[PDB]
């Protein structure tokens, strides 16, 4: 599923975009677009539109999970245990309208927003390495999800 070159390209793009923000300006610009393009997930996340600061709260807190998961892409025995739990958490949120169908799509559109921080440094290996790592990150959260 992943390779040493990709695992390295993943930890190399997370130390820059998530330097001190840990991915704060990554989900706020991604979730915001998802909420706008999708008016069915806004009430689910807890926002009224794309002009809501809450978006920067979820897209940010969520990015962190991807960070703790970036320190173990080849080791899917523990970093996947925490993500699997997040799914169980989404099984009873304040909206009870979560779905893994928005994950993939919201995951791909997320890599296009990461370039906003490392614009110019995000090469193909950066979006590809993360495009292969985010698959195991989110895919590992859909397990406990819909519980």
- Binding site per annotation, positions for heme b: 90
Task: Report residue 118 as tokens.
Answer: 């490392």
- Pick between residue 5 and residue 112 the one whose CB is nearest to ligand HEM: 112
Q: How far is the CB of 127 from ligand HEM (least distance, A)?
A: 16
Task: Looking at the chain, list the stretches that DSSP marks H as alpha helix, in order from N- to C-terminal side.
Answer: 4-17, 24-37, 42-45, 53-70, 79-90, 103-114, 124-144
102: enclosing H helix or E strand:
none
Exactly one of 3, 8, 95, 146 binds ligand HEM (CB under 6 A); which one?
Answer: 95
Q: How far is the CB of 63 from ligand HEM (least distance, A)?
A: 8
Cα 118 to Cα 90: distance, rounded to the nearest angstrom: 30
Cα 50 to Cα 144: distance, rounded to the nearest angstrom: 28
Q: Does 65 bind ligand HEM (CB under 6 A)?
A: yes
Q: How many residues does the chain have?
A: 147
Q: How far is the CB of 123 from ligand HEM (least distance, A)?
A: 23
Cα 29 to Cα 93: distance, rounded to the nearest angstrom: 22
Exactly one of 13, 17, 28, 103 binds ligand HEM (CB under 6 A); which one?
Answer: 103
- Pick between residue 58 and residue 80 the one whose CB is nearest to ligand HEM: 58
- Please give the residue ranges that form the binding site for ligand HEM (CB under 6 A): 41, 44-46, 58, 61-62, 65-66, 86, 89-90, 93-95, 98, 102-103, 106, 137-138, 141
């Amino acid at each position: 599923g992943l390779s040493a070159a990709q695992r390295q390209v993943v930890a190399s793009t997370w130390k820059d975009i998530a330097g001190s923000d840990n991915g704060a300006g990554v989900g706020k610009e991604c979730f915001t677009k998802f909420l706008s393009a999708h008016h069915d997930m806004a009430a689910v996340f807890g926002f009224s539109g794309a002009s809501d600061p809450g978006v920067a709260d979820l897209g940010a807190k969520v990015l962190a999970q991807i960070g703790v998961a970036v320190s173990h892409l080849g080791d899917e025995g523990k970093m996947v245990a925490e993500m699997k739990a997040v799914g169980v958490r989404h099984k009873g949120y304040g909206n009870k309208h979560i779905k893994a169908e928005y994950f993939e799509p919201l995951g791909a559109s997320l890599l296009s927003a990461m370039e906003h921080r490392i614009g110019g440094k995000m090469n193909a290996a950066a979006k590809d390495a993360w495009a292969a790592a985010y698959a195991d990150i989110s895919g590992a959260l859909i397990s406990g999800l819909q519980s």
